[PDB]
């Protein structure tokens, strides 16, 4: 059984980063070489593993997280980073073992007038824990008085639209991101490769 990486990298819709998708990859052969040796990827950074040797490795499970962010935000999808994406949307742990893979998707994820469907969490009182996924839409209280779910001054919907336009500078353009995290237990290794 080949690992279904095609379902992940070649999916048609990608999630908003605040509602990032996770795909559990198990009981399959993972050919990571078809990926690292491809021209498709502007980012391919691995941590706790060498990207070349991936195909010699077995793992207990592999998770593939995916979402869209700005090109100048890909730098935040790494251990030790801070910013609106790392703090409030998708957080990698300090001891992350896996790979971060991104490519420019301006062709599919932009629209002439501005694509506004992709969102990120702008307001949150405290930082996300690693691999925490917050889908709350609770109106955010920025002032002294409770909002009780009504929008207004100091009372803000917590999610913000990216607004991707094809003529954006490259930092403002959308990038699709796949995060492979390599899980290891004292358990059977179900994802090995070649």
């Amino acid at each position, epitope marked *: 059984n080949l690992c279904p990486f095609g379902e992940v990298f070649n999916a048609t819709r990608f999630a908003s980063v605040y509602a990032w998708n996770r795909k559990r990859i198990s009981n399959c052969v993972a050919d990571y070489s078809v990926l690292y040796n491809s021209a498709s990827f502007s980012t391919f950074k691995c941590y706790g593993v060498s990207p070349t040797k991936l195909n010699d490795l077995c793992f207990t499970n592999v998770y593939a997280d995916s979402f869209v962010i700005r090109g100048d935000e890909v730098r935040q999808i790494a251990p030790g980073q801070t910013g609106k994406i790392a703090d409030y949307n998708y957080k990698l742990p300090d001891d992350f073992t896996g790979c971060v893979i991104a490519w420019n998707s301006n062709n599919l994820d932009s629209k002439v007038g501005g694509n506004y469907n992709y969102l990120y969490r702008l307001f949150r*009182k405290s930082n996300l824990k690693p691999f925490e996924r917050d889908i709350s839409t609770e109106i955010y209280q920025a*002032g002294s008085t409770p909002c009780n779910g009504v929008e207004g001054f100091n009372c803000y919907f917590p999610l913000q639209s990216y607004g991707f*336009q094809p003529t954006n500078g490259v930092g403002y353009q959308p990038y699709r991101v796949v995060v492979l995290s390599f899980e290891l237990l004292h358990a059977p290794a179900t994802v090995c490769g070649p």
Partner: antibody
Amino acid sequence: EVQLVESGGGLIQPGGSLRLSCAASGFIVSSNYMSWVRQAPGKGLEWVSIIYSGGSTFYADSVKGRFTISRDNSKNTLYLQMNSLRVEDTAVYYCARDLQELGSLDYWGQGTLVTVSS
Amino acid sequence: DIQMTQSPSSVSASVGDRVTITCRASQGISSWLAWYQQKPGKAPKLLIYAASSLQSGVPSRFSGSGSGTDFTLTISSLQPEDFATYYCQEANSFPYTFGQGTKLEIKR
């Protein structure tokens, strides 16, 4: 209503240190993005620093490693600690509540003047 | 970084005129642009956020427009208290660069 009052400006020699304060009413400083913006005499405006509700901090390149932004939730007050001051830090310093790209800098204090001179 | 160019530096007008001020960003920033007004010895005041949204309390003769690289502030019929300096600002990437400002002064 809602207010922002800066204080702590004054005369300091190059190499000196200074802390500015920004006391807020209405806004909860710890729940907002808060930024400091400065204006050298006769010049335009320059964003210098921002603090996130969750605690992350960021800095313009001209002040990185010398200035520190912080807050005291209990006093609803924002701070900018300014170390290793230079002549070119001479400016009126404004604190502002920051709504990022949602609503930009919608409330500013009156500003406090820092003069760095020998 | 992104450069924000305001031109001209100075605009001459009379009360009642239609005034338009432009701001150009060096790369496409969609609609993430703010306009501020400032008077001598006073803090800046926000007029327009997100390129075209009018800030609460700001007279409706003020409007913003544009998307991408070229943005405009328009005052539909000038009033005496409108003579001031105007600044645009990149709102959605560090270091939140302000334009160099356009001064609105009285024609005679």
